[PDB]
Design a protein around this ligand. Structure first.
Ligand SMILES: Cc1cc2nc3c(=O)[nH]c(=O)nc-3n(C[C@H](O)[C@H](O)[C@H](O)COP(=O)(O)OP(=O)(O)OC[C@H]3O[C@@H](n4cnc5c(N)ncnc54)[C@H](O)[C@@H]3O)c2cc1C
Ligand SMILES: O=C1O[C@H]([C@@H](O)CO)[C@@H](O)[C@@H]1O
Length: 478
């Protein structure tokens, strides 16, 4: 049984692979692996871009433990087995009139894997998902099955719920839901100047805001979503006219066959496949994409779970950092300054950077390991995601792009992250081979994360034989 991540950038053939159907079966596996000193890294859907959950030695999946256990109608709360995919939870909650406060760009993540990395959506007043956990059960190699909440060892709770699978196997999570509700989604394009003008008010007056930045253009795609006051309503280009700049650029007879079945994101892939690391060509692809978005202005209505998802396109390298951008009441220009510099940087160095650079916002988290950890609840973090696509399975083309991206992320590390106090998404952080880079990263982590000594303390205590951790965890936290 091989496990491969979403983008096929990491795979693992674990010597031992468990898939219990019950807590009792899980408890027994962890007791025996404790006794025998055998590795058992928790794995959810295995999607993490950086293979965080992977172990050559042993992995345990709770995929078969995926029921909604309890819905507290009054407090709008759901208790669910960790192996439930976010999508299974949404479907289950449908009849009870509830949804999650936020969704990621996909919903194939297990609830366990979702909370253990502090995954997030967008909305300057909405925390990452780890802040939405009211309680959890956790099978530990030292103390068996323990229960954590604000009431029950609140300090361990806040450490554990965003634990990177290093503190125990989550079996059960209770989540603070909200009423199931429709969103009105408004997509429109702006210039940086137009973005700057309205930004401060836009974040604060719209429930969800997302900017898709298009390198080597002055097109920013703005997507706002707000609840629809019950029974409210809402140029207009065909699909063929929207896709026309991309089809014309690919065909370069008058027409296009086979191509016409390709979606917007499949066209971008086929276009980048042509000369992925040629900047002049990527400038041409990003311009064609800007034209597509300019022809895609308008409104959509759907349940929040349908609206808050995004087509992320083909296999890819991603890097996403969270950095402080003030609070609700004291705005910071840092989120827009970061993007100015990032665009200036990409031109300065001729980076063949495709679109989009995704920019989102979350409220702060009380979880000490959250990239958006803050002591103040009304802090605001901007998250900025850079991307390079792997549009084919040409092993040589994928190697060149892997290196291209390594240097792109490396230029953001050296020039921006320290300056802006940026922390890497736990599912997207890669471990340097160069020990100078590796020490540098550990130094960066001690800077971002003050409670790192408490995380290792909690590991010694709950996982003394260290069967829950892999080379990644040990290399990041020694
Ligand atoms: C296309 C795509 C889009 C994405 N969009 C977003 C996004 O919008 N926002 C965002 O924040 N993230 C996003 N991600 C990242 C994603 O949410 C995380 O990688 C998430 O951790 C994946 O869930 P999983 O079930 O695959 O977890 P895995 O990768 O399987 O595991 C993640 C972590 O959880 C631990 N773990 C898993 N199950 C358990 C358990 N039961 N008990 C204890 N520890 C456990 C693992 O050991 C590991 O540390 C995206 C990823 C992809 C590929
Ligand atoms: O990992 C991730 O990839 C998505 C990306 O493809 C956006 O262009 C992003 O939403 C998510 O965090």
């Amino acid at each position: 049984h091989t496990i491969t991540n979403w983008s096929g950038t990491h795979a693992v053939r674990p010597k031992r692979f468990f898939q219990p159907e019950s807590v009792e079966e899980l408890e027994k596996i962890v007791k025996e692996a404790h006794e025998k000193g055998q590795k058992i890294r928790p794995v959810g859907s295995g999607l993490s871009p950086n293979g965080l959950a992977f172990s050559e030695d042993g992995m345990v999946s709770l995929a078969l433990m995926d029921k909604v256990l309890h819905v507290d109608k009054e407090k709008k709360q759901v208790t669910v087995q960790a192996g439930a995919r976010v999508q299974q939870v949404v479907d289950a909650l449908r009849p009870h009139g509830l949804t999650l406060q936020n969704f990621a760009s996909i919903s194939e993540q297990q609830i366990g894997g979702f909370i253990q990395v502090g995954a997030h959506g967008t909305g300057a007043r909405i925390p990452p998902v780890d802040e939405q956990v009211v309680s959890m059960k956790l099978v530990t190699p030292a103390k068996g099955t323990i229960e954590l909440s604000e009431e029950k060892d609140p300090e361990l709770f806040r450490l554990a719920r965003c634990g990177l699978g290093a503190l125990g196997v989550v079996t059960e999570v209770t989540l603070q839901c909200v009423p199931r509700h429709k969103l009105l989604e408004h997509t429109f394009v702006a210039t940086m100047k137009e973005v700057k003008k309205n930004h401060e008010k836009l974040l604060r007056e719209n429930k969800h805001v997302r900017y898709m930045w298009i390198p080597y253009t002055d097109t920013v795609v703005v997507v706002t979503c707000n609840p629809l006051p019950e029974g409210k309503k809402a140029p207009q280009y065909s699909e063929d006219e929207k896709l026309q700049p991309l089809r014309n650029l690919l065909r370069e007879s008058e027409t296009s066959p086979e191509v016409s079945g390709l979606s917007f994101t499949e066209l971008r892939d086929a276009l980048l496949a042509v000369d992925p690391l040629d900047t002049e060509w990527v400038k041409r692809v990003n311009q064609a994409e800007a034209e597509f978005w300019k022809r895609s202005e308008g409104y959509r209505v759907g349940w929040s779970d349908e609206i808050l998802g995004f087509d992320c396109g083909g296999q890819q390298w991603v890097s996403e950092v969270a950095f402080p951008a003030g609070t609700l009441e004291k705005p910071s220009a840092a989120d827009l300054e970061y993007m100015e510099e990032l665009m200036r940087l990409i031109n300065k160095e001729g980076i063949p950077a495709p679109a989009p650079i995704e920019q989102r916002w979350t409220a702060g988290s009380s979880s000490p390991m959250s990239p958006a950890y803050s002591p103040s609840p009304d802090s605001v973090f901007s998250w900025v995601g850079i991307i390079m696509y792997l549009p084919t399975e040409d092993e040589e083309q994928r190697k060149a792009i892997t290196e291209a991206f390594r240097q792109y992320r490396k230029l953001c590390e050296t020039r921006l992250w320290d300056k802006y106090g940026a922390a890497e998404h736990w599912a997207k952080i890669e471990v340097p081979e160069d020990p100078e880079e590796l020490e540098a990263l550990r130094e960066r982590l001690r800077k971002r994360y003050p409670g790192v000594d408490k995380f290792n303390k909690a590991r010694r205590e709950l996982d003394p034989k260290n069967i829950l951790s892999n080379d990644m965890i040990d290399s990041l936290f020694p």
